[PDB]
Structure formats: structure tokens, C-alpha cells
């Protein structure tokens, strides 16, 4: 069960604390968590009805904020883990938010256009009470895409009748209709900000230093290419589901992928030479970044890791007791909702432009999260540094020692 993993690790997070039992027991339960049925008219002419939610874990800091996933296999446990989860996302970083998440069980490959069209209007229909600007914006996020993003944002200024700032009520829409400007390298760039924060932790300076990534997808491919222009690294390794390519000279960022979209994959590529991920992993370099599958790191693979830094861009790709192990060989973890925070943190900026009713540039926003991720970062490893305990739990403690004190200021707790 993804909610009592949730909150095992609240548990384990408040271990290395001092919150009191009140506190504790509020955070174990989301605070509001809505399942609507959510009607649409088929191609065919039937109407079919589907489950959506909208979990609300905790606004004590702010309006909720969180994705909305379209997944056959979506279930009540995993959307409120997810926005357990998405609260202290948004605490590691200080925003002034707090934890969302939405979920539709549907299969969207079997929709049409407008089917999902339908879909997304008859969604923001059903959870329009429970959303809004101030109240809670939701996010793209599995299956979903900007275009359905818009299509939301269209059917709540419709409903709403546009008594405010309804480009602000959902974040991740298209640029012409309230959207921001470096969305696209959210998360890579936030990794790379996170890698150079360790690496002058650490004392490591990365230029002409070796990076081997591990997922050659959106995230991964920009954080090597990120890597590759401004951190001055060189990209030895890259792999794909179907395999992986390490070259000790170094790989064109660009090249790998125009290859893997010519050809489907990264295989086989000129020069480099065809590697398994398993080995790739355990590749001996300075960043290793899992931007793939999770779970990559387990007992079989824990001491073989021979990165100084594990850079974890995927969703906990490192098992805790894999944790334990690395942390036990001196590797330096930056924490998987630390890493990755690039992504909501854009999207807070892009909130935040469309309440304004200004919007930036390209510079200011890379300028902006260069500071929130290196303040982020340099809390965590003070946190590391003073408790003597490992990062993942330093960051834990910080989200959570965040909330508590917003949820202690507004007197929900007296304790």
C-alpha cells in the first residue's frame, strides 16, 4: 500500500525530530480528499462515467499544488501518497504550498481528441469547489500534457466567469495561454544546480569531470546536456531501456539523441560502445544521475557505486537500505524530491507570473531557481552536516519541521 509506505516514512522522518503526537496524527491524514464521478459522451454517442480525485494532504502553508495523472491503474492510496508526498516537495524548497494531487482511472490511449477534451472539461466541472487560485492548482503530470492543461484552464474560466485570475487556477499550459518560459528544463536544471551546489560542498570542481546518466528521456537527456555546456563535464555514458553507450572520450548530447529519435534507441552508437545498465551504473565516475525506472540501486549493485555523487533525478531510484550502504561508503545522495524539485518550482514561478499578471524571461527564471534550489540544497546539507544523519532524512526533517511550524503558527496545534 503506497499510503502506508507514506506514512511509514513520515514516521521514520519524525524520528530524527522533536514533533509532538498531535502533529504527527494531523499529518498521517490528508486533510480533505474528494472522489467524483466524472460523466463524458463517447464518439460512439454512449456516456461513460469515470472515478476522478483530488486530494488536499495539507494547506497549512499555502494552496495545495499537485498533478493530475490519467492511468488505468490509479487508486485512492496512490493519489493521497502522492500528495503526502508533494507536501514536502514543496517544503524542501519553501514555497508557499502545499500538498495536491488528482487521479483519473482511465486508459487515455483509447481516447480520442475530444474524448479527452470531454474529459479534462468534465473533471474541472466535477472538482471545481475544491479548486481554484488561492484554494488549489493542479499540474500536468502522468499522460497528461499542456494541452489538456488548457483545455482545464478554458473550462474553469468558463465556469468561474472570469472574476480573477483564472490562468492561475492550473500551471503547465501552453506558452501563448499563460504559460512560462523554462518549463521544458525545469528539472534538469534544477539537478544540475543541486550537482554544482554538492560538487562545492564536496570541494570537487566539475569542469573536464566525468557525468554518466542513467535514462535518456526528457529529464535525463537535458540534465547531460545541461551538464555537458554549463557544468563543463563530459558525458561518458548514457542509456535507454533497450540499453546503454559509454564512450571514455565523451558523447554528443545532441547526437545521442537525434540517433535514439532516428532509430528508436541509443544502441549501437558511433564510436561508443554498447553497455547493460547494471554496469553502467557502477561506471566509474563522479556524478551518476538516475533520471529512469526506480529502484536501480539495491543490495546487488549498493557497493559497486563508484560516483562520488548520486544525483537521484528519477523518483527514488535508491533503496534505503542502498541508502545506508552509500552513505556508509562517504557518497554524497542528493535526496530524490530534492533533486527533481526544479519542476514544481517552475511551476510555482509560472503561478506566480500568471497572478501577477507580469511574465518573465528565460534569464530571470533560470536566475530564480538557481537561487531557491541553491538555498534548498545548502538547508538540507546544514541539516546533514549538524544531525549527523543522512541526507534523505536531513531533507525530511526540514520539510516537515516547515510544515509544523506553519500548521503551529495557525493554531491548528497547540503543541
Known amino acids: 500500500d503506497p499510503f502506508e509506505m507514506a506514512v511509514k516514512q513520515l514516521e521514520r522522518a519524525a524520528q530524527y525530530m522533536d514533533?509532538?503526537?498531535?502533529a504527527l496524527e494531523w499529518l498521517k491524514k490528508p486533510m480533505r480528499i474528494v472522489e467524483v464521478s466524472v460523466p463524458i459522451e463517447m464518439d460512439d454517442g454512449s456516456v461513460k462515467v469515470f472515478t476522478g480525485f483530488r486530494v488536499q494532504h495539507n494547506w497549512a502553508r499555502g494552496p495545495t499544488k499537485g498533478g493530475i495523472r490519467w492511468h488505468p491503474a490509479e487508486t485512492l492510496s496512490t493519489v493521497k501518497a502522492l500528495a503526502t508526498w508533494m507536501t514536502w516537495k514543496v517544503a524542501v524548497v519553501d514555497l508557499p504550498y502545499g500538498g495536491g494531487k488528482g487521479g483519473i482511472i482511465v486508459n487515455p490511449k483509447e481516447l480520442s481528441e475530444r474524448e479527452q477534451e470531454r474529459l479534462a472539461r468534465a473533471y474541472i466541472r466535477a472538482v471545481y469547489d475544491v479548486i481554484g487560485p488561492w484554494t488549489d492548482i493542479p499540474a500536468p503530470d502522468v499522460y497528461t500534457n499542456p494541452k489538456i492543461m488548457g483545455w482545464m484552464m478554458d473550462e474553469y474560466e468558463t465556469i468561474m466567469r472570469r472574476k480573477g485570475p483564472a490562468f492561475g487556477v492550473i500551471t503547465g499550459k501552453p506558452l501563448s495561454i499563460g504559460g512560462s518560459l523554462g518549463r521544458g528544463t525545469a528539472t534538469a536544471q534544477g539537478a544540475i544546480f543541486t550537482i554544482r551546489e554538492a560538487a562545492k560542498a564536496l570541494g570537487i570542481d566539475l569542469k573536464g569531470k566525468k557525468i554518466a546518466v542513467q535514462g535518456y528521456g526528457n529529464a535525463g537527456y537535458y540534465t547531460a546536456k545541461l551538464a555537458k555546456e554549463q557544468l563543463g563535464m563530459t558525458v561518458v555514458a548514457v542509456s535507454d531501456s533497450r540499453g546503454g553507450i559509454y564512450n571514455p572520450d565523451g558523447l554528443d548530447p545532441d547526437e545521442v539523441l537525434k540517433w535514439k529519435r532516428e532509430?528508436?534507441?541509443?544502441?549501437?552508437?558511433?564510436?561508443?560502445?554498447?553497455?547493460?545498465?547494471?554496469?553502467?551504473?557502477?561506471?566509474?565516475v563522479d556524478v551518476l544521475?538516475?533520471?529512469?525506472?526506480?529502484?536501480?540501486?539495491?543490495?546487488?549493485?549498493?557497493?559497486?557505486?563508484?560516483?562520488?555523487?548520486?544525483?537521484?533525478?528519477?523518483?527514488?531510484?535508491?533503496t534505503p537500505e542502498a541508502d545506508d550502504i552509500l552513505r556508509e561508503k562517504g557518497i554524497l545522495q542528493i535526496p530524490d524530491f530534492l533533486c527533481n524539485a526544479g519542476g514544481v518550482t517552475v511551476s510555482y514561478f509560472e503561478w506566480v507570473q500568471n497572478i501577477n499578471g507580469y511574465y518573465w524571461t528565460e534569464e530571470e527564471v533560470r536566475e530564480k531557481l538557481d537561487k531557491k534550489m541553491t538555498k534548498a540544497f545548502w538547508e538540507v546539507y546544514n541539516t546533514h552536516k549538524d544531525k549527523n544523519i543522512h541526507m534523505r532524512d536531513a531533507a525530511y526533517v526540514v520539510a516537515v519541521s516547515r510544515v509544523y511550524q506553519?500548521?503551529?503558527d495557525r493554531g491548528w496545534v497547540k503543541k
Open 19 to 22: 514533533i509532538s503526537e498531535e
Open 263 to 284: 532509430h528508436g534507441s541509443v544502441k549501437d552508437f558511433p564510436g561508443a560502445t554498447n553497455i547493460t545498465n547494471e554496469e553502467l551504473l557502477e561506471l566509474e
Open 289 to 318: 544521475a538516475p533520471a529512469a525506472i526506480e529502484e536501480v540501486i539495491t543490495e546487488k549493485n549498493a557497493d559497486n557505486i563508484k560516483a562520488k555523487i548520486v544525483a537521484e533525478v528519477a523518483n527514488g531510484p535508491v
Open 406 to 408: 506553519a500548521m503551529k
